[PDB]
Amino acid sequence: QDKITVTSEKPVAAADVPADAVVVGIEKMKYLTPEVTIKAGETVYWVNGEVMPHNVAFKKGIVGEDAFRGEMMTKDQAYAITFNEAGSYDYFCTPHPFMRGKVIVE
Ligand SMILES: [Cu+2]
């Protein structure tokens, strides 16, 4: 089905993120780590630092045949995606498509 596994449909509190996680922070309309590289099976967390809501989304054909739109995080919410397959995955923020980043899975 999908190259990815979503954990929780819902955003979790940043207080729920584990200490050893790879975390991509979001501040000032930017993903703070624009290119992160993990191994298949690892989970990436995004944590929104600001009051502007931000999500993580994938166009069609990137993590599956369909498009994927994560739920919106408000301030200090976090969001997790587990990447099962090796590859390069671009995401963007649905209401702010100039916000982009990528995950390299190997
Ligand atoms: Cu955004």
Side-chain angles (χ1 to χ4, degrees):
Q1 325 311 76
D2 265 265
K3 269 75 164 310
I4 63 168
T5 301
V6 182
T7 330
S8 179
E9 200 190 66
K10 184 179 162 190
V12 304
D16 298 344
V17 180
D20 59 344
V22 290
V23 180
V24 172
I26 312 165
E27 259 296 279
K28 319 277 55 89
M29 309 296 276
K30 285 159 68 187
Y31 294 110
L32 292 196
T33 314
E35 202 172 290
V36 59
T37 144
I38 55 172
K39 288 145 285 287
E42 288 189 74
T43 302
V44 186
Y45 291 75
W46 283 267
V47 178
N48 186 13
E50 48 187 25
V51 289
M52 184 76 88
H54 296 296
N55 77 333
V56 171
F58 297 94
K59 295 277 170 211
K60 258 212 319 296
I62 304 290
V63 284
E65 188 181 81
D66 300 304
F68 184 78
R69 201 223 91 128
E71 279 189 46
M72 306 298 301
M73 296 161 261
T74 61
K75 183 181 174 44
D76 301 310
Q77 294 189 312
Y79 192 84
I81 299 182
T82 300
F83 284 87
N84 301 310
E85 279 199 63
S88 297
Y89 307 81
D90 307 287
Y91 56 94
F92 59 96
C93 175
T94 294
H96 312 131
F98 51 89
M99 290 177 74
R100 296 167 205 257
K102 86 140 85 300
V103 188
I104 302 146
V105 190
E106 30 166 70

